[PDB]
Enzyme design. Structure first.
Site, mmCIF file in Angstrom:
data_model
loop_
_atom_site.group_PDB
_atom_site.id
_atom_site.type_symbol
_atom_site.label_atom_id
_atom_site.label_comp_id
_atom_site.label_asym_id
_atom_site.label_seq_id
_atom_site.Cartn_x
_atom_site.Cartn_y
_atom_site.Cartn_z
ATOM 1 C CG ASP A 1 40.258 -36.278 133.224
ATOM 2 O OD1 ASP A 1 39.768 -36.162 132.089
ATOM 3 O OD2 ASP A 1 41.200 -35.566 133.633
ATOM 4 C CB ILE B 1 27.218 -37.737 135.981
ATOM 5 C CG1 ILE B 1 26.163 -37.925 134.910
ATOM 6 C CG2 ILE B 1 27.145 -36.253 136.310
ATOM 7 C CD1 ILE B 1 24.766 -37.814 135.454
ATOM 8 C CG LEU B 2 31.797 -39.525 140.550
ATOM 9 C CD1 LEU B 2 32.018 -38.093 141.022
ATOM 10 C CD2 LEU B 2 31.279 -40.379 141.724
ATOM 11 N N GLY B 3 33.586 -39.051 137.525
ATOM 12 C CA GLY B 3 34.793 -39.754 137.148
ATOM 13 C C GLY B 3 35.905 -39.461 138.120
ATOM 14 C CG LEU B 4 39.892 -41.439 140.205
ATOM 15 C CD1 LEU B 4 39.527 -40.999 141.607
ATOM 16 C CD2 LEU B 4 40.560 -42.806 140.210
ATOM 17 N N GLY C 1 26.072 -40.383 120.598
ATOM 18 C CA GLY C 1 25.207 -41.471 121.036
ATOM 19 C C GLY C 1 25.669 -42.299 122.227
ATOM 20 C CG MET D 1 31.040 -38.791 130.045
ATOM 21 S SD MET D 1 31.677 -37.371 129.154
ATOM 22 C CE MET D 1 33.072 -36.897 130.131
ATOM 23 C CE1 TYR E 1 46.985 -33.620 133.889
ATOM 24 C CE2 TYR E 1 45.477 -35.487 134.165
ATOM 25 C CZ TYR E 1 45.682 -34.134 133.937
ATOM 26 O OH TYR E 1 44.596 -33.328 133.613
HETATM 27 N N1 LIG Z 1 41.875 -30.241 131.572
HETATM 28 C C1 LIG Z 1 42.668 -29.575 132.417
HETATM 29 O O1 LIG Z 1 43.403 -28.650 132.096
HETATM 30 C C2 LIG Z 1 42.622 -30.008 133.855
HETATM 31 C C3 LIG Z 1 43.192 -29.175 134.803
HETATM 32 C C4 LIG Z 1 43.082 -29.494 136.155
HETATM 33 C C5 LIG Z 1 42.363 -30.628 136.500
HETATM 34 N N2 LIG Z 1 41.821 -31.513 135.546
HETATM 35 C C6 LIG Z 1 41.291 -32.845 135.910
HETATM 36 O O2 LIG Z 1 40.418 -32.647 136.991
HETATM 37 C C7 LIG Z 1 40.860 -33.458 138.066
HETATM 38 C C8 LIG Z 1 40.417 -32.803 139.371
HETATM 39 O O3 LIG Z 1 40.998 -31.503 139.599
HETATM 40 P P1 LIG Z 1 42.272 -31.329 140.606
HETATM 41 O O4 LIG Z 1 43.089 -32.557 140.607
HETATM 42 O O5 LIG Z 1 42.868 -30.023 140.317
HETATM 43 O O6 LIG Z 1 41.677 -31.156 142.088
HETATM 44 P P2 LIG Z 1 40.421 -31.494 143.007
HETATM 45 O O7 LIG Z 1 39.786 -32.704 142.516
HETATM 46 O O8 LIG Z 1 39.703 -30.214 142.996
HETATM 47 O O9 LIG Z 1 41.177 -31.670 144.428
HETATM 48 C C9 LIG Z 1 42.112 -32.737 144.614
HETATM 49 C C10 LIG Z 1 42.637 -32.484 146.012
HETATM 50 O O10 LIG Z 1 41.496 -32.535 146.905
HETATM 51 C C11 LIG Z 1 41.684 -33.649 147.811
HETATM 52 N N3 LIG Z 1 40.443 -34.409 148.123
HETATM 53 C C12 LIG Z 1 39.760 -35.297 147.345
HETATM 54 N N4 LIG Z 1 38.701 -35.788 148.009
HETATM 55 C C13 LIG Z 1 38.728 -35.121 149.174
HETATM 56 C C14 LIG Z 1 37.795 -35.205 150.197
HETATM 57 N N5 LIG Z 1 36.703 -35.948 150.131
HETATM 58 N N6 LIG Z 1 38.050 -34.526 151.331
HETATM 59 C C15 LIG Z 1 39.156 -33.793 151.452
HETATM 60 N N7 LIG Z 1 40.023 -33.691 150.457
HETATM 61 C C16 LIG Z 1 39.826 -34.316 149.292
HETATM 62 C C17 LIG Z 1 42.747 -34.571 147.207
HETATM 63 O O11 LIG Z 1 43.497 -35.263 148.248
HETATM 64 P P3 LIG Z 1 44.052 -36.764 148.178
HETATM 65 O O12 LIG Z 1 44.414 -37.091 146.761
HETATM 66 O O13 LIG Z 1 45.262 -36.665 149.056
HETATM 67 O O14 LIG Z 1 43.023 -37.641 148.773
HETATM 68 C C18 LIG Z 1 43.592 -33.610 146.398
HETATM 69 O O15 LIG Z 1 44.536 -33.109 147.333
HETATM 70 C C19 LIG Z 1 42.364 -33.619 137.838
HETATM 71 O O16 LIG Z 1 42.982 -34.698 138.517
HETATM 72 C C20 LIG Z 1 42.387 -33.824 136.347
HETATM 73 O O17 LIG Z 1 42.076 -35.196 136.184
HETATM 74 C C21 LIG Z 1 41.980 -31.177 134.201
HETATM 75 C C1 LIG Z 2 46.841 -28.431 135.327
HETATM 76 AS AS1 LIG Z 2 46.965 -29.583 133.736
HETATM 77 C C2 LIG Z 2 48.678 -30.542 134.077
HETATM 78 O O1 LIG Z 2 45.585 -30.700 133.603
HETATM 79 O O2 LIG Z 2 47.396 -28.556 132.301
#
Ligand SMILES: NC(=O)c1ccc[n+]([C@@H]2O[C@H](COP(=O)([O-])OP(=O)(O)OC[C@H]3O[C@@H](n4cnc5c(N)ncnc54)[C@H](OP(=O)(O)O)[C@@H]3O)[C@@H](O)[C@H]2O)c1
Ligand SMILES: C[As](C)(=O)[O-]
Length: 315
Positions: A43, A14-17, A9, A12, A48
């Protein structure tokens, strides 16, 4: 809309950091700027190693009355070393302490694979391989359901589960809470049409991670494909007068996915928010889908022989 209904209920954003790879010295400022800019969903994860610093930023913005707590949607994840029934409440409370909150909006099982408990996030044996826990997905799920009945979290979910592992939970005898969310990797090179169809048919919301291709992943290789630099995707962006990142963030949104781009850079954090004002056409969408090459950033390659490794199944 800007928010999706979960099976509990709650709604969420749709966009997060995202905050993976966000250095502890920069992330407090990053989360403060995000909240100023209009983000309401962050997120997080214990693994991390920056949740304390994320929490300083959340506290500052609540204290300032920029947001109320009920307007925020804060997500964290249970790491693989705490899958045992008796370790789960403890992992959760630790994250809550660091974040300086009294409940989470959503708590995810980070990976389906349990590891031996300890201080190392990836315990290795003498042969250098990862040591598995003998726990299974169903017992960990029962501990997570506890957390909901105790008020620690509002919703529980999963991350990197294949469709059979999701099935397993949905068929659990005495299942009390369905998973609200399955957070998976998704972008034009790994489009996930099958798993997304499956989860959506079951009332499970999908969150796309690594939406930009994770150009900062620590295992990056120079031959490796780059989404942000794909000339085919640059062309679609130019047509819409947007950046290629804004196109890559808009794409999962039109598939009714939640998307969580990571940035620690104030102008990019701002840029990434400006995606509610335009629409990719259906030709654009079909075109982006056609770019799928089944390429994964996160394949957990040290656990490819774990009994619960998620990526041997097709979807
Ligand atoms: N559940 C899981 O196993 C899992 C795994 C991976 C990811 N995630 C989550 O998903 C999030 C996002 O994935 P991710 O961190 O792998 O990578 P991403 O969001 O695909 O890419 C992050 C990279 O892209 C750059 N970036 C961001 N905005 C940009 C833009 N407008 N123009 C050019 N470059 C840009 C960032 O640079 P700067 O920071 O230098 O600006 C950073 O180097 C993670 O932080 C985490 O919270 C979860
Ligand atoms: C790539 As990860 C540290 O969200 O298992």
């Amino acid at each position: 809309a800007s928010r999706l209904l979960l099976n509990n209920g709650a709604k969420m954003p749709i966009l997060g950091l995202g905050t993976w790879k966000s250095p502890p010295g920069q992330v407090t400022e990053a989360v403060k700027v995000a909240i100023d800019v209009g983000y309401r969903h962050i997120d997080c994860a214990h693994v991390y190693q920056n949740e304390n610093e994320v929490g300083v930023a959340i506290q500052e913005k609540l204290r300032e009355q920029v947001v109320k707590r009920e307007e925020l949607f804060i997500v964290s994840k249970l790491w693989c070393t705490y899958h045992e029934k008796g370790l789960v409440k403890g992992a959760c409370q630790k994250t809550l302490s660091d974040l300086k909150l009294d409940y989470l909006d959503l708590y995810l099982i980070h990976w389906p694979t349990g590891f031996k408990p300890g201080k190392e996030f990836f315990p290795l044996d003498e042969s250098g391989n990862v040591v598995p826990s003998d726990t299974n997905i169903l017992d960990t799920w029962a501990a997570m359901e506890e957390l909901v009945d105790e008020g620690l979290v509002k919703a529980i979910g999963i991350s990197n589960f294949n469709h059979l592992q999701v099935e397993m939970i949905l068929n659990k005898p005495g299942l009390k809470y369905k998973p609200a969310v399955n957070q998976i990797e998704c972008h034009p090179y790994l489009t996930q049409e099958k798993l997304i169809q499956y989860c959506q048919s079951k009332g499970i919301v999908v969150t796309a991670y690594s939406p930009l291709g994770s150009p900062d992943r620590p295992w990056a290789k120079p031959e490796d494909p780059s989404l942000l630099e794909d000339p085919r995707i640059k062309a679609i962006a130019a047509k819409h007068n947007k950046t290629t990142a804004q196109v890559l963030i808009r794409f999962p949104m039109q598939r009714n996915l939640v998307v969580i781009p990571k940035s620690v850079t104030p102008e990019r954090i701002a840029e990434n928010f400006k995606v509610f004002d335009f629409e990719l056409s259906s030709q654009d969408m079909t075109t982006l889908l056609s770019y799928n090459r089944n390429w994964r950033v996160c394949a957990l390659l040290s656990c490819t022989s774990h009994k619960d490794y998620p990526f041997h199944e097709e979807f």
